Amino acid sequence: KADIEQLPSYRFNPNNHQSEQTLCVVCMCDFESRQLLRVLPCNHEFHAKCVDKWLKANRTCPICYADAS
Amino acid sequence: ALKRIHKELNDLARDPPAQCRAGPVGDDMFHWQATIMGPNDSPYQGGVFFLTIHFPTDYPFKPPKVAFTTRIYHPNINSNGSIKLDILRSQWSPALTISKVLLSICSLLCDPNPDDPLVPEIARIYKTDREKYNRIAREWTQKYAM
Amino acid sequence: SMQIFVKTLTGKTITLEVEPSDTIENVKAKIQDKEGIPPDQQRLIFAGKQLEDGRTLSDYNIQKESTLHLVLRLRGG
Ligand SMILES: [Zn+2]
Ligand SMILES: [Zn+2]
């Protein structure tokens, strides 16, 4: 929906340790430098592209099962 | 989807579920078989149960279709091997792995969900006459899964 | 010397006054003042970048009326 574009996104930078999320659970791939990360209301973030598809059909944080609209 | 199926396959190797095996039967990665040993200190102790695992085309956005091939006496598992489990249908999430599903099934065998049953008669025995429930389960474990 | 927006939380709104020269770590404290959030609970994001506590509004190039994104981390999500 349009809602998926209203959530923050930010290219990952390995050097700075602001979040403890080192892995996109949908891809099961470490976060790689400059990759686009999408953060959900619940402070859970994944690969933007990777989690984007899941929000089309569902609306819950894959990790903690929290709504994100 | 392929890439993530392979990922899970390594994850199983690095942290194999307790007395459980799973993997593709042949060259097709989307169809696996799995075996689970009946949990110790359960009615099923000593049994070997075989399962089929089928990954949807768009896995992990759709959950895998899992089913028993071995007959089993259990309130949430029917004579067709269908399994009444929540993570497999409506509580499915990309964050879930094949390992987590196998461990959930493994715990379901230890602790059924008789309040939301797949086989009423056996649910009703489980709540009211657990002693009969286990003897029958032990009998079935002894008969079709040894 | 400049208006800024941080409308987020889904209960979005917030208008702030600041100087370009203000470090992000000043920003998070002014958000603690308009709102109750402890600064270390705050994750500021803008034009595709996390904002480093030490860097400033000029560094990142935030111009008047830029509307920015706050994410609340929790004590054990
Ligand atoms: Zn990913
Ligand atoms: Zn979450």
Residue numbers in the entry:
A (entry chain C): 390 to 458
B (entry chain A): 2 to 147
C (entry chain F): 0 to 76
Relevant lines from the article:
RING family ubiquitin ligases (E3s) employ the RING domain to recruit the E2 thioester ubiquitin (E2∼Ub) intermediate to catalyze the transfer of ubiquitin (Ub) to substrates.
Having determined the crystal structure of RNF38RING alone to elucidate the position of Arg454, we subsequently attempted to crystallize a subset of RNF38RING LP variants, namely, R454Y, R454K, R454D, R454N, R454W, and R454M in complex with UBE2D2S22R,C85K−Ub. The RNF38RING-R454Y/UBE2D2S22R,C85K−Ub complex diffracted to 2.6 Å. Therefore, this could represent an extremely weak site for Ub with Kd in the hundreds of micromolar range or higher and the contacts observed in the crystals are likely due to crystal packing akin to those reported for RNF38RING/UBE2K−Ub/K48-Ub2. (A) There are two copies of the RNF38R454Y/UBE2D2S22R,C85K−Ub complex in the asymmetric unit, with no discernible structural differences between either RNF38R454Y (magenta) or the E2s. The electron density for one of the Ub molecules (salmon) is markedly better for one of the two copies—the poorer copy is missing loops with only the core interpretable, so we focused our analysis on the better copy. Therefore, the reduced activity of RNF38RING-R454Y in ubiquitination is explained by the suboptimal positioning of UbD, as revealed by both NMR and crystallography.
